[PDB]
């Protein structure tokens, strides 16, 4: 027997035309809902997803009430009601993870049959059902309970067509003066705090709805003596926005000839990276099923080269 | 042979009384300097450290010029000059990591031999020299080039005396109704995004001056059957301020007797942690020497228990 990444339980009658308003392809989720009610039915629904899509089913009128989800707010419980003849959706009730409540119901016919819905993870991808003058039937599309949410298959498609802009900064300067007839030897040492940074842009509130990690390598700069080029480092796990603090070091012996001066300057290169990326968001459920949604965005990073030094004789 | 965590090169004459103004013991560093110059000498210096200490040597007058370091700004190069008779300090010049320059010199006699100083890491702990009416001699105390800066031996000395305040939040509710004549069995699943947080307070700008890591475990909550108690998790490496995103899950079978209802509510506990800490900052230099500074502060955290559930029969 087979398992599924979504769960959908439709309540109501058999009439109307099919509709499906589903953010599954890009993992856009339910942001806002507005419901019109009549005497013996839900007349209409208007729905907004987090990618800006918006649509209306059935008929909407001045009786409409709405509910807008806050970022990070999901559904804890949901009930749908038939209208009692069993021919229309009768009412919608849910309670969120922040204990806010929404309830829209037919006015005249007293609320008859309550169906308590399995909301899965509580993360709603939209609605599906049948409508015509009214909402004949409807259910909420939920992602099943989630085990992980990981952005992967990372690509930087314009990377090898673009040159890094490596800016050199001085870190330390020291001078050694040998006024003797014996060649001298000194130890040069230098250090610098650097902060590497990585940022992959996200949209449609996926960063607040899901707990995102990125399984990818980071764009790095690579020293050729033709100049510099981009490559992608070792692959690992990252937060969507991450910084890594480090102390870079450099030490070496300095040989100072008789009756001469040696001046040593230590440098490092710094590169700001701005690159488009494509990737895949994979949401894996507790039941083992999964859902993939293509992503596109921009990567902003800050990286550094190794410390180097120039020794000049005078 | 023997190595040291600090480096100090004094320039000037032989007269005056010894002084030392050094932030070594608590790793307080140079924040601000002000210098008075006369005709044939540096007359005086006033120095401020990042822990608010402040002191003056020699004499200060209306000729005083000052320089204040920005957070994260260190010294890239320093030169000192004698006054030309070789009896006093004659001039100070430095250039910072952000290319800002400070230059204070004797107004009348002219500058001869420049002594380019080894600034080590460029992180200055204060000054040392000899002064009377004027600055007879002075040098800047620098930490040698740094390999690492690590907060360790982490202790929460009041931890055993305060009880965690664990607040329960509902995550999901589902109902299973068995209207048949044989026991039914179902599977409950639930998930919730959580964000754990860790923060160890710092002072004296050590977080901006050094690249700090904390080698410690994270304070967590633990199930006793008196209630809850604090413990410290497994040790690892952390930034001073850190957050971890996670998805908590729960799944189990639900058994429903004939003609009965079972209502399942999934919950999770949340605890804010606010606790004093003591620790040791160890700065290890590239040359192998090191510097210890005792630390005292407060830990602020956010943690969560495992998801649990209550199943109620009706």
What does this structure look like?
The structure is a homodimer of 314-residue chains. Chain A has two domains: 142 residues, no CATH class; 168 residues, no CATH class. In chain A, 1% of the residues lie in helices and 65% in strands. Chain A is built from one helix and 22 strands. In chain A, a hairpin with a 4-residue loop joins strand 5 and strand 6. At the A-B interface, strand 14, strand 15, strand 16 and strand 19 of A face strand 14, strand 15, strand 16 and strand 19 of B. Chains A, B: This is Natterin-like protein. Chains A, B: Pfam families: ETX_MTX2, Jacalin. Chains A, B: It comes from Lethenteron camtschaticum. The PDB classes it as antitumor protein.
Radius of gyration of chain A: 31 Å
User: Looking at the chains present, what oligomeric state does this protein adopt?
Assistant: homodimer
How many helices of chain A? The count is 1
Determine the fraction of residues in helical runs of chain A and give it as a percent range.
under 10%
Query: How many strands appear in the DSSP assignment of chain A?
Result: 22
Distance between the termini of chain A: 81 Å
Largest interface: A-B, 45 and 42 residues
Kindly estimate the percentage of residues of chain A that lie in beta strands according to DSSP: over 45%
Protein name (chains A, B): Natterin-like protein
Pfam families (chains A, B): ETX_MTX2 (PF03318), Jacalin (PF01419)
Domain Jacalin-type lectin (chains A, B): 5-144
PDB class: antitumor protein
